[PDB]
Amino acid sequence: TISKTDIDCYLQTYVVIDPVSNGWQWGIDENGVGGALHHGRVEMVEGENGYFGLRGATHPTEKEAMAAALGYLWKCRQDLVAIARNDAIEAEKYRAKA
């Protein structure tokens, strides 16, 4: 009975929302820390013609870039989803305990 937004609570640390001048381009942080400077192994990707940036469309608002990031994570990368699932289950058991 663990809902989807409680899994998104721990899945959102795997995304990174970089600011560009047009808008907000989401990405994927493989180390799960939101693209930190030192502990952050961000996933950079190779595109069509010399594209080395974040996997993610340049969205107008952060609310939609984060939503497209969460939708990509739910569609394709289910190992990070299983990580966030077990995190949400341990959080629910923690609030059942403390």
């Binding site: 069509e48 594209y51 993610g56």
Partner: protein, 335 residues
């Protein structure tokens, strides 16, 4: 009680290969073994908006401001060369045999009843209508999908390949053989007996099918289209990719197989709409419709569950459709 098998996986009979499209000039079709390939090159496209608006974007200032920023794409496009008017689409087709034997089936009593049912079909009426319609969909170049619709003259050459070479060579005029009538011929019936001997397991059948189409000098040919990555901007978008095996445009093998399966003129809707591909819940996705819906008793599953389990054999057309689905392959069975 003979319940249905929970797993039922049939291997695909009638295996085609990817259809390599090369190009050249007509009247040297007979020297078309070193024709240069059709290559998938890129071009840039700019267009204004043409899709419908949703009554919120119908402000005239907003419409003008949106057509002042039109979308820039690059598209993979395949053309004939500017000195070549003929597209040669070449593939090979294997007809296997053993149509009723499934590759995975739990219930052995169901497998025995299914094999007895299919063998009763083949003993009563062999793969003679099915191979005739498969021979038609080879003979009319239906596997030329959009390369056929404006073609001036299409000619299909089918060669039976024995131990190393052509054991028997056909040559058809694919515009005389229409896309909707399964008529009779003397050479089509020989191709039908060959595909029938393949589907019955009585002989190894491998056909090299070549189709030439007079399109025009430098016109657009249409290989099968891939799906794209969607990881970057919207100006170098690469909005269209096309299939190619090695620097040479091609149609997917399942598109050729979907053209070859277009034998179903027995669906309960109107037959003036032409043959459709043999699918369970027989559905053309372009028209967005499912003929042989399960409420009418004419999908593959209720026909198979009435033929095998409770021994209500349908009419001979619907069991042609059932055996065409078993030749088609598929993953049948519940969870």
């Amino acid at each position: 009680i003979l319940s249905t098998a929970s797993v039922l996986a049939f291997e695909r009979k009638l295996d085609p290969s990817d259809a390599l499209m090369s190009a050249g000039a007509w009247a040297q079709r007979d020297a078309s073994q070193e024709w240069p390939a059709v290559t998938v090159r890129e071009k840039s496209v700019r267009g204004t908006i043409s899709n419908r608006l949703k009554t919120k974007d119908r402000d005239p200032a907003k419409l003008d401001a949106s057509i002042q920023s039109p979308n820039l794409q690059t598209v993979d496009v395949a053309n004939l060369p500017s000195d070549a008017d003929t597209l040669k689409v070449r593939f090979t087709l294997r007809v296997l045999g053993g149509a009723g034997t499934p590759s995975a089936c739990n219930d052995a009593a169901y497998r025995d009843k299914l094999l007895q049912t299919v063998a009763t079909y083949v003993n009563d009426q062999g793969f003679a209508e099915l191979a005739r319609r498969y021979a038609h969909n080879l003979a009319n170049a239906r596997f030329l999908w959009r390369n056929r619709v404006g073609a001036e003259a299409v000619e299909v050459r089918i060669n039976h390949i024995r131990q190393g070479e052509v054991a028997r060579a056909w040559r058809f005029d694919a515009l005389a053989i229409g896309l909707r009538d399964f008529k009779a011929d003397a050479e089509l019936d020989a191709l039908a007996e060959l595909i029938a001997s393949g589907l019955s397991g009585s002989g190894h059948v491998l056909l090299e099918v070549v189709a030439f189409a007079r399109i025009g000098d430098g016109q657009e040919v249409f290989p099968s289209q891939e799906l794209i990555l969607d990881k970057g901007d919207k100006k170098g978008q690469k909005s269209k990719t096309l299939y190619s095996v090695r620097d040479a445009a091609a149609i997917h093998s399942q598109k050729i197989g979907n053209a070859l399966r277009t034998i179903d003129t027995w669906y309960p809707d109107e037959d003036g709409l032409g043959p459709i591909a043999v699918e369970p819940y027989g559905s053309v996705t372009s028209q967005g419709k499912a003929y042989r819906q399960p409420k009418q008793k004419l999908d593959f599953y209720t026909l198979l569950d009435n033929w095998v389990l409770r021994d209500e054999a349908p009419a001979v057309e619907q069991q042609h459709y059932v055996i065409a689905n078993l030749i088609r392959g598929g993953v049948f069975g519940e969870a």
